[PDB]
Structure 1
């Protein structure tokens, strides 16, 4: 590897995630199709799960972007189910230390998925196993 490639890729992905979120939120508020997360979640998740990238992704606050992608859309609907499932999986995969959970606030949206009665059974169960897993790492 050229030594700069990891950080370059990590930085580029953070920017891309922020850009997609902002574009989908603006389209949603304008009552237009907002399919940016749908179309990019799979390739972005491949990046987020790359072991060589984990420390720099986490160091640059990628959890803030993963939280934003999971959060309600401006009309209060939730992001499409594939996003909810793929990003929960990403989160289960990453080795995340408690302080990064704290600064990012990503536990709050995962906790919501775990108690949301309108959520699918499989997503709600995955969120619950994530809350438990993170709670075990915290204490």
Structure 2
């Protein structure tokens, strides 16, 4: 009932939107100023990233690189706001992420960092460990 061309178009559009917001936030950080792009769009974007109809296309289109980039340090090396870090981990957790996606994305690297990062809340560190445990299970299960 949604055409495969439409699912693809919307997945691509979401990808490009995550990239534009990332790049605008990073450029603002480099101008000594607040990045508000991600915080203003994370709920709505997270909601859509978790659409079960869209996930397979989003995953196949490398959406994990954008999620990754949103979890990464800004130019001044501060971290994205805690609501973003929490919400995007909650997105990775509910997505049907399998071995193929990890071996291709680098996301497991940023997530792993969160799990052992001493500046991170026990809550987030915990949730990143859970993700790590789950993804170890994907990668290695018979």
Cα distance between partner residues in 1 of 2:37 and 2:81: 11
Q: Summarize deviations over 1:52-79 as a string: whole Å, max 9, x none.
A: 0011001110000000000011111110
Rounded Cα–Cα distance in structure 1 between residues aligned with 2:120 and 2:41 = 22
Offset of residue 33 of structure 1: 1.6
State the SS of the aligned residue for 2:10.
helix
Q: What is the 5 A alignment of 1:1-139?
A: 1-139=2-140
Q: Which SS does the other structure have where 2:4 is aligned? A: coil
| Cα displacement string for residues 11-33 of structure 1 (whole angstroms, at most 9, x for unaligned residues) | 10000000000000000011112
| Aligned residue pair count | 139
Structure-1 separation of matches of 2:131 and 2:23: 27
With normalisation by structure 2, the TM-score equals 0.95
How big is each residue's C-alpha offset from its partner over 1:45-102, in whole Å with a ceiling of 9 and x where there is no partner?
Answer: 0010000001100111000000000001111111000000000010001111212112
Q: Distance in 2 between matches of 1:51 and 1:84?
A: 21
Per the normalisation by structure 1, the TM-score is 0.97
Q: Which sections of structure 2, spanning at least 5 residues, go unmatched?
A: none
Computed over aligned residues only, the root mean square deviation of the Cα atoms, in angstroms, reads 0.8
SS of alignment partner, residue 78 of structure 1 = coil
Task: Provide structure 1 residue ranges, at least 5 long, that are not aligned to the other structure.
Answer: none
